[PDB]
Design a protein around this ligand. Structure first.
Ligand code: AGS
Ligand code: AGS
Ligand code: AGS
Ligand code: ADP
Ligand code: MG
Ligand code: MG
Ligand code: MG
Lengths: 324, 174, 328, 536, 348, 104
């Protein structure tokens, strides 16, 4: 039949259905209702609600029949370069609809994939046709947009959703969907989402179809994430066993779980600050693990880097034992 | 291309010193009767790294949003990593306080700022930070090495924590 | 006109993939429903991942429709992900007709096999996620990797994950003996055992080395020497000489042994691999093992950057000699 | 009250007015004089009526670097010898049908007006007797709209009766072009000749300038004559750099300080400030640190290391031009100075290896000092690069490298100075360690203010040329390895040439001179003499 | 030509040493499934001689009919790079690392073109055309990935022979697709036998002692031993048992450089060694070879315990030399740090 | 489409069922308070993050040229020509400077 995603189904069709950003939403609505909408630069991590904000804004400005003629949406990753800025964008910005008098809107999603010369022409297109059309650029990294293009727009950082405000809407969609989750399930959802409502709804939905129960273990075996017990046992093997036993056990667990060394370093880094270590031991472990993670970027043997990771803890194991 | 450059006199424009940006900013302020503070002027000048268009855009956006020029309103308008947090993190790295420095760094990471933005703000604050010459040199060396790693593709909280641990090791080692 | 024995002797059909029970079972129940979900095969190299996905493709499709309606790309392309995005967009937009004379119609979707999917960075993985959620019904993806943890959460959440376990050495020796009996080459069981040992559980490398040795030997028996020098593996005599030079404490004979290893054409990464395997599986102390393995990782990283073999090997042997003579 | 650029105001109207490339100028002038003689003899044969030995090819080709004077020499020779230039630039649509059907008749037919103001040389576009002469300017620039242009100029080779001159700056164009033409090479002119030429044009404008500043400018823009002329026009007509009177006999003021204006260092520094005095004095102020970081950043955008290239002069150490408590205090100064110098060099190695460069080096060719790189030509199409580039990294890495280099230099300079003020105690002891603390610099790095490279690039290019000419002989042309060639074949060739020269100087048999002919090697005798000299 | 280029073997039965390896290379082409080769070993061991022998055994004698072509290739940044290529009617030969970071570019288009060449040329001799990639160990990671893609794409139409000296930089994806041919250096007896075989064809009778001296002083380099024999033939007509072998000019230059380093440890001597290394680098001598010779002669003049520290320092700065674009900086970093260590060591 | 995770469990490996470690280091977990200073409480002064100063220079810049370069007299002109000829003894100064004088 039809099982649509919960990301699409639970979409903020109106500007009042966003949950986290309220200062910039009030600012954007005040830009809407006094007819002073500027060029916008909505930037931030994915799943924060930039496309939803601009789509609700365009629904507030234009109607259904004139949506296909007054607002033009592009993805810069589909065709980069000035073959699209000088082309559809320039002709859209310079023409006028026959009977519909007002201002047009250009929604340039994924603007950071645009090349430097295409941005150098898009800024001029923005400057020359400000009254006829407004431009809203949606991007993830502000560092991949030239400052000349940034300065023509008003920036809006859509920060990751804090768990204290992300949990109520997650509980609302849990109650609406009638899903049997536990509190560790919500904790794992808001831990692996990392301020991403699309990721949260996708992981929760996929876990629900995969198991029917959404606990910590079902979430962690649904998204293919390293378990907390696995990383704790790896830390125990580095902290208590000798070199060869730890090497054998960690290699066997890596083969058994499909586990790389980059993600082992990622989880062990978070375990380093939680575990009560001295300052010198913590500094040494962080430095050694950062070097091991950098050495894995270029093509190197993962066995030798794993032995180096065990060595990084065996350097300070006897020091902690003798320190007591 | 070089044949075109051979037929033209090339004139190099350099970044505007902050005194010139301040003079133009006070010219704009006195011609618009905008209330301000020296805190806000320093914040606007920090946010515009030798870019007068960025300085004027930040000033106009701050007055359009709140009408008062102070660092709270300026850094609410621009939404960068605040230089006070970066200053406290670098100060904790100077005192080899890895826990508090990582607390600041993890707070910035959970606020969602990109690693490039964090390392740029770290370099900008440490460039004007009050410290010894040799310690500043080792700090800038580790910042540049970490930034090279960020540019090469490896960017994570592990890399920034390793940078902070290296900065603490610079203080703990002669 | 002849094909390599890796391509010639892979299983034609599903349930001919030995030592994989649950993966074959879910692939069979996907064949029965004629719908293939998004797949993610992770396991050691040479363990039957490409064989299983290709067998599913040939048995879901026709023998003449198998190569036309699947696309095998390598995800480690050096020109970013956007070029691979262009290939997936072109293959999704391009449509071909399908008709089977066996009485079963073709599925409406298509198969994109993205190999070494773990080598893609998280930004490239997030960029690919848009393509696979924008072409979900008309295109299905199978990501082939070795580490499921390198695949990001939005991808791994929407994929069906399968783990491939490596075959035992007895099974690999049996398959290699069957291959050698099929291709009519004189080889004992000892040479096949040494081949399986020198491949380290890699059946693809074992079959490649066997075919290459049959081509090189010209119809004679496969000795241990041809297998040793066709796999690039340094013999254990040179490794024992390196360790004896390190334990002796004389730098001149250390230089002599290193220069002898360099003169024989042996690689330095292979020597670092053999030295690591010797060090981590012996009776050295934990401090000695830690320092030696850290230096081995640093030397391996330096060799990967393009540094000279002789200087890195001399430095590593100096470190190993100092650590072994620290007990003296 | 002047409306002319200084390139065309001071354009050479005579072939003797051009600077440098006298052999190429003489070759082109002789070729055009022979063509003019052939035209006048044709006119005399027409008046009377109503070629291996000559070997006068119908076409010359002229190649060299940009701005050296190929077009200027062509125009001066054609003006002197009375030719009329029909110019085909890349700035007009020149496809094969148009160039043939609109300029073949200039070669094939007489000039309808042979006397008057026809000595003016026009161009070609399509939106005393004067002999016609075609000039294809910048033949390496081929567009897609110039379809069949190569076939058209090949037809111009085949069916012309008036001379054709080709101007190009691509060094490898003469390889891929098939045909018969006299090849003329324009080499880069010497520093001092162009420096005196620019001093001449400045002295015509009532300005006094020093040779060293012009030499710095010319070695900055690599002897591009037109570029230096135009920047000189901009700098002179805007009032000059700095009022400083230099009394020299070897009276008006001198006007040194043009090179610092060229690199844009005067937009950072005050007019009272001097770059050498700024770098020599100890910096403490925040504004001084900003100025140093901005200066170093402006030099890192060019991927040029300013401090290390001029390391001897900027350091507080003695510089010479190339022609027991007392013992513990003599040794400790040198040990501390060597320690600080080694620390600074380790810092520079750190910045070169483990810090990102804003311009990705060895992009189109390999690293420096290699004869295998080939030729890199600019784009000939109207399509953009369309590849992903990171602008934030290029914005931040220059400031990072500049700040780290400035801090490394300040630490090193402070360490060497805090070693150096205690040299007065050693001087009072009667022992002089300054002969060990000195720096010996070459004359090439001493006649300029500041250098962008610390090596002898002329010696490097001479070595590159002799390496190319050794391994371009037909016997050595098929050697598979290249660095192994210059590491194994070439030293043995140098030893063989040295032994052959020793045999020749010993009055031995002349057959030993034919040893390279005995093994049938085709190395030119100038190269054999070059290899036989020494290994410097 | 010289004996290194005239008396070079062309058939697989003419190779004096490595007779079992030459026989295996002879039966390699008989099956008709000739794969990509990875011919690696030390310099001058006999690699390129064996590639020419295999190429002669594959095609006819027309592989010896050689010519040189120049190809201009457009980079994706819209720039043109011109490269040289040894070519014949059946094979190709190129050094793709001559284009710097754009080696991948001359990796792609060039093999693409030669594939189309084999699509156009028909002679019913062999299905493929062999292209010889020289110095594959100097290729960047992007270049090696593009090479992997190109070998997987155009396998049926063209074949590849990768001649390198170091498989460490060569990525494991490349090594898993080409048959490995390890060519170790000839021994002292092998070099002496080849030298006597070559010298007999000139009508000259060199002694065994001179041949042993040439074999010992060449460090198992057959090309260098033959060329030193050429220099000895140039120097004297009869081959005395105590005939002086002429040493390499840059080698004695590096020797004098290292004595200059050891003798005085001052900033002035550091700048003198700076000038010496600049003048060595202007002669296109690779910085790895300079570093190896410098380290060898410094370890000649070092003490027992200092040898390991000096060697680790030299390997560190050689890796940094490979990392940096300006190798001179890391060369003088190693020289200055060694001078500081030497001055510290002799003070107590 | 429905997702599933298949991990072929082997009970003999004994790494599938892993318990939390009993060592005191991994039992007692250190707590970070996640408390940071408020950002509008301290404030920023002038010149804290830049090279700004309270004193601004005046009269040391904006100096208009307004230069009147007088024509060089004949004797000074030959003196400067002789100076350039002494600087470059191999150059042909006498055959270029009158021609450039005619060019002006
Ligand atoms: N503030 C929010 N409140 C409620 N739901 C949200 C919010 N932000 C995101 N979502 C959910 O996330 C889904 C997709 O979010 P999008 O706004 O499309 O992501 P995005 O902001 O476009 O990020 P990128 O960079 O474009 S991938 C929506 O359909 C919602 O279900
Ligand atoms: N379980 C298995 N059943 C049957 N054949 C197998 C099995 N495991 C490995 N093989 C054989 O091993 C060879 C290589 O396996 P492939 O599946 O083709 O490659 P692979 O496992 O994907 O390794 P990669 O691609 O390098 S990660 C083929 O000849 C397969 O037939
Ligand atoms: N050798 C020279 N002597 C005198 N003036 C010169 C000389 N070289 C260049 N110029 C001046 O520079 C101007 C332009 O030089 P051109 O001859 O056009 O350069 P070019 O050799 O054609 O190289 P191109 O065309 O830019 S690639 C001339 O009009 C002269 O004013
Ligand atoms: N088997 C052999 N018999 C006689 N001469 C040989 C033999 N092998 C190599 N040579 C000579 O030694 C030289 C080998 O150089 P080459 O193999 O091209 O160096 P590289 O191995 O670095 O490519 C050739 O010039 C050849 O004349
Ligand atoms: Mg979106
Ligand atoms: Mg596969
Ligand atoms: Mg010209």
């Amino acid at each position: 039949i039809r099982n649509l995603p919960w990301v699409e189904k639970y979409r903020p069709q109106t500007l009042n259905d966003l949950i986290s950003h309220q200062d910039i939403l009030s600012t954007i609505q005040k830009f809407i209702n006094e007819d002073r909408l500027p060029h916008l630069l909505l930037y931030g991590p994915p799943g924060t609600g930039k496309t939803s904000t601009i789509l609700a804004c365009a629904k507030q400005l234009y109607k259904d029949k004139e949506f296909g003629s007054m607002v033009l949406e592009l993805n810069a990753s589909d065709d980069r370069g000035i073959d699209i800025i000088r082309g559809p964008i320039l002709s859209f910005a310079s023409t006028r609809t026959i009977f519909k008098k007002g201002f047009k809107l250009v929604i340039l999603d994924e603007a950071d994939a645009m090349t430097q010369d295409a941005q150098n022409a898009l800024r001029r297109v923005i400057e020359k046709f400000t009254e006829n059309t407004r431009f809203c650029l949606i991007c993830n990294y502000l560092s991949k947009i030239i400052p000349a293009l940034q300065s023509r727009c008003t920036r809006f950082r859509f920060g990751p959703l804090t768990p204290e405000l992300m949990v109520p809407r997650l509980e609302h969609v849990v109650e609406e969907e009638k899903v049997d989750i536990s509190e560790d399930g919500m904790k794992a959802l808001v831990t692996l989402s990392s301020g991403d409502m699309r990721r949260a709804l996708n992981i929760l939905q996929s876990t629900n179809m995969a198991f029917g129960k959404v606990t910590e273990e079902t979430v962690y075996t649904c998204t293919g994430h390293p378990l907390k017990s696995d990383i704790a046992n790896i830390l125990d093997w580095m902290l208590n066993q000798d070199f060869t036993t730890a090497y054998r056990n960690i290699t066997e667990l890596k083969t058994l779980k499909g586990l790389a060394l980059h993600d082992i370093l990622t989880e062990i880094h978070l375990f380093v600050h939680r575990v009560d270590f001295p300052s010198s031991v913590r500094i040494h472990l962080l430095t050694k693990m950062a070097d091991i993670e950098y050495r894995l970027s270029v093509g190197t043997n993962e066995k030798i880097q794993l032995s180096s990771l065990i060595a990084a803890f065996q350097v300070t194991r006897d020091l902690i034992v003798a320190e007591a | 291309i070089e044949p075109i450059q051979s037929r033209c006199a090339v004139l190099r424009y350099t970044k505007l010193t902050d005194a010139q940006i301040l003079t133009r900013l006070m010219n704009v302020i006195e011609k618009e009767r905008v209330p301000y503070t020296d805190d806000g002027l320093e914040a606007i000048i920090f946010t515009a790294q030798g870019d007068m268009r960025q300085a004027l855009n930040n000033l106009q956006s701050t007055f359009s949003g709140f009408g008062f020029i102070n660092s709270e309103n300026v850094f609410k308008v621009c939404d960068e990593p605040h230089p006070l947090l970066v200053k406290e993190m670098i100060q904790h790295c100077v005192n080899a306080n890895i826990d508090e420095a990582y607390k600041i760094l993890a707070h910035l990471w959970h606020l969602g700022y990109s690693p490039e933005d964090i390392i740029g703000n770290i370099f900008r604050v440490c460039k004007t930070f009050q410290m010894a010459e040799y310690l500043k040199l080792e700090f800038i060396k580790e910042i540049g090495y970490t930034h090279m790693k960020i540019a090469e593709g490896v960017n994570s909280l592990l890399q920034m924590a390793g940078l902070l641990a290296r900065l603490c090791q610079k203080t703990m080692a002669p | 006109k002849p094909v390599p024995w890796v391509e010639k002797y892979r299983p034609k059909c599903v349930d001919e993939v030995a030592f994989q029970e649950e993966v074959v079972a879910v692939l069979k129940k996907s064949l029965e429903g004629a719908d293939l979900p998004n797949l993610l095969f992770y396991g050691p190299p040479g363990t039957g991942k490409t064989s299983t996905i290709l067998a599913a493709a040939r048995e879901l499709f026709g023998p003449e429709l198998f190569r036309l309606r699947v696309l095998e790309l390598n995800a480690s392309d050096e020109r970013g992900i956007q070029v691979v995005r262009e290939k997936v967009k072109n293959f999704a937009q391009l449509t071909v007709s399908g008709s089977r004379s066996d009485g079963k119609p073709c599925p409406p979707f298509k198969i994109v096999i993205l190999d070494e999917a773990d080598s893609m960075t998280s930004a490239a993985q997030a960029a690919l996620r848009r393509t696979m959620e924008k072409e979900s019904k008309t295109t299905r993806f199978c990501l082939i990797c070795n580490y499921v943890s390198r695949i990001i959460e939005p991808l791994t959440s929407r994929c069906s994950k399968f783990r491939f376990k490596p075959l035992s050495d007895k099974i690999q020796q049996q398959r290699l003996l069957d291959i050698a009996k099929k291709e009519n080459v004189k080889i004992s069981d000892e040479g096949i055992a040494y081949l399986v040992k020198v491949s380290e559980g890699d059946l693809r490398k074992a079959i490649t080395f066997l075919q290459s040795a049959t081509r090189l030997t010209g119809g004679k028996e496969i000795t241990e020497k041809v297998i040793t020098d066709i796999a690039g593996v340094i013999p254990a005599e040179k490794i024992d000489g390196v360790f004896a030079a390190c334990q002796s404490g004389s730098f001149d004979k250390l230089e002599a042994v290193v220069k002898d290893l360099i003169d024989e054409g042996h690689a330095a990464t292979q020597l670092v691999n053999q030295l690591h395997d010797v060090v981590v599986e012996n009776n050295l102390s934990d401090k000695q093992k830690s320092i030696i393995t850290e230096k081995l990782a640093e030397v391996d990283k330096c060799l990967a950057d393009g540094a000279d073999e002789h200087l890195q090997l001399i430095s590593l042997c100096a470190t190993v000699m100092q650590q072994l003579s620290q007990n003296c | 009250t002047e409306d002319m650029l200084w390139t065309e105001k001071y354009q050479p109207q005579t072939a003797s007015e051009l600077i440098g490339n006298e052999l190429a100028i003489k070759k082109l002038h002789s070729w055009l004089k022979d063509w003019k003689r052939r035209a006048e003899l044709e006119e005399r044969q027409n008046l009377k009526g109503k070629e291996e030995e000559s070997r006068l090819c119908n076409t010359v080709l002229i190649t060299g670097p940009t701005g050296v004077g190929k077009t200027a020499a062509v125009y001066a020779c054609a003006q002197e010898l009375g030719f009329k230039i029909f110019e085909v630039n890349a700035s007009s649509q020149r496809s094969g049908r148009q160039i043939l059907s609109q300029l073949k008749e200039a070669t094939q037919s007489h000039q309808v007006d042979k006397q008057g103001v026809n000595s003016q040389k026009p161009c070609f576009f399509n939106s005393k007797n004067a002999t016609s002469l075609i000039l294809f300017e910048e033949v390496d620039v081929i567009f897609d709209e110039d379809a069949g242009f190569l076939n058209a100029i090949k037809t111009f080779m085949a069916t012309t009766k008036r001379p054709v001159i080709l101007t190009t700056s691509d060094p490898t164009f003469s390889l891929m072009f098939d045909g018969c033409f006299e090849e003329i090479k324009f080499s880069t002119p010497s520093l001092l000749n162009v420096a005196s030429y620019l001093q001449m044009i400045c002295l015509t404008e009532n300005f006094r300038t020093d040779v060293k500043d012009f030499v710095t400018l010319l070695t900055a823009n690599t002897c591009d004559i037109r570029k230096s002329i135009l920047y000189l026009q901009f700098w002179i007509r805007s009032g000059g750099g700095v009022l400083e009177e230099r009394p020299l006999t070897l009276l008006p003021k001198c006007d040194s300080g043009c090179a610092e204006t060229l690199f844009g260092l005067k937009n950072i520094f005050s007019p009272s400030e001097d770059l050498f005095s700024f770098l020599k004095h100890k910096i403490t102020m925040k504004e001084e640190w900003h100025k140093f970081i901005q200066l170093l950043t402006e030099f890192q955008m060019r991927n040029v290391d300013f401090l290390y290239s001029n390391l001897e002069f900027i350091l507080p150490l003695p510089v010479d031009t190339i022609p027991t408590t007392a013992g513990k205090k003599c040794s400790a100064l040198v040990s501390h100075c060597l320690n600080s110098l080694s620390e600074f060099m380790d810092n520079m190695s750190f910045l070169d290896a483990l810090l990102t460069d804003v311009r990705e080096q060895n992009k189109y060719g390999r690293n420096d000092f290699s004869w295998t790189n080939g030729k890199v030509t600019s784009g000939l199409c109207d399509e953009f690069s369309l590849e992903s580039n990171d602008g934030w990294t290029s914005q931040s890495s220059g400031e990072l490298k500049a700040a780290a280099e400035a801090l490394s230099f300040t630490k090193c300079s402070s360490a060497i100075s805090k070693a150096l003020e205690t040299l007065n105690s050693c001087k009072k002891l009667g022992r002089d360690p300054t002969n060990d603390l000195t720096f010996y610099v070459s004359q090439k790095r001493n006649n300029v203010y500041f250098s962008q490279s610390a090596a002898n690039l002329d010696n490097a290019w001479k070595r590159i040329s002799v390496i190319k000419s050794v391994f371009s002989s037909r016997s050595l042309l098929y050697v598979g390895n290249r660095q192994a060639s210059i590491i194994e074949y070439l030293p043995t060739l140098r030893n063989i040439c040295k032994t052959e020269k020793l045999k020749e100087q010993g009055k031995s048999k002349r057959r030993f001179l034919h040893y390279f002919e005995g093994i049938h090697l085709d190395i030119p005798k100038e190269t054999v003499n070059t290899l036989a000299a020494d290994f410097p | 030509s010289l004996w290194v280029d005239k008396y070079r073997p062309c058939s697989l039965g003419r190779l004096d040493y490595h007779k079992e390896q030459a026989a295996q290379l002879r039966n390699l082409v008989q099956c008709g499934d000739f794969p990509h080769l990875l011919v690696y070993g030390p310099s001058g061991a006999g690699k390129k001689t064996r590639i020419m022998c295999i190429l002669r055994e594959l095609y006819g004698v027309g592989v010896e009919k050689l010519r040189i072509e120049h190809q201009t290739i457009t980079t994706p940044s819209k720039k043109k790079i011109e490269i040289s290529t040894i070519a014949s009617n059946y094979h190709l030969e190129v050094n793709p690392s001559d284009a710097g970071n754009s080696d991948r570019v001359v990796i792609q288009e060039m093999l693409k073109t030669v594939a189309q060449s084999q699509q156009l040329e028909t002679n019913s001799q062999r299905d493929f055309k062999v292209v010889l990639l020289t110095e594959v160990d100097k290729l960047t990671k992007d270049a090696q990935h593009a090479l992997r893609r190109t070998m997987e794409k155009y396998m049926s139409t063209c074949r590849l022979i990768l001649c390198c000296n170091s498989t460490s930089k060569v990525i494991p994806p490349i090594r898993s697709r080409c048959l490995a041919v390890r060519v170790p250096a000839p021994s002292i007896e092998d070099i002496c036998h080849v030298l006597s075989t070559v010298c007999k064809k000139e009508g000259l009778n060199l002694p065994s002692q001179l041949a042993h001296r040439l074999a010992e002083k060449s460090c198992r380099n057959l090309r260098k031993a033959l060329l030193m024999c050429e220099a000895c033939r140039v120097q004297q007509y009869p081959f005395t048992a105590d005939q002086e072998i002429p040493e390499t000019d840059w080698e004695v230059y590096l020797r004098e450089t290292a004595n200059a380093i050891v003798s005085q440890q001052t900033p002035q001597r550091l700048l003198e060694v700076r000038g010496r290394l600049y003048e060595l680098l202007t002669h296109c001598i690779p910085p790895e070879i300079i570093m190896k010779g410098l380290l060898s002669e410094l370890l000649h003049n070092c003490d027992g315990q200092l040898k390991g520290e000096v060697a680790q320092m030299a390997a560190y700065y050689e890796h940094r030399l490979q990392l940096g674009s300006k190798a001179i900086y890391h060369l003088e970093a190693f020289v200055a740090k060694f001078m500081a260590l030497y001055k510290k060591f002799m003070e107590d | 489409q429905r997702v599933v995770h298949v991990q072929q469990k082997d009970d003999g490996c004994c790494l599938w069922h892993l318990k939390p470690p009993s060592c005191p280091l991994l039992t007692k977990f250190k707590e970070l308070n996640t408390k940071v200073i408020d950002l509008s409480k301290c404030g920023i002064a002038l010149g804290e993050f830049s090279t700004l100063n309270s004193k601004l220079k005046s009269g040391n810049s904006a100096a208009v040229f307004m230069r009147t370069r007088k024509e060089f007299t004949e004797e000074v002109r030959n003196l400067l020509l002789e100076e350039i000829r002494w600087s470059n003894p191999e150059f042909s100064l006498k055959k270029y400077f009158p021609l450039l004088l005619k060019k002006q």
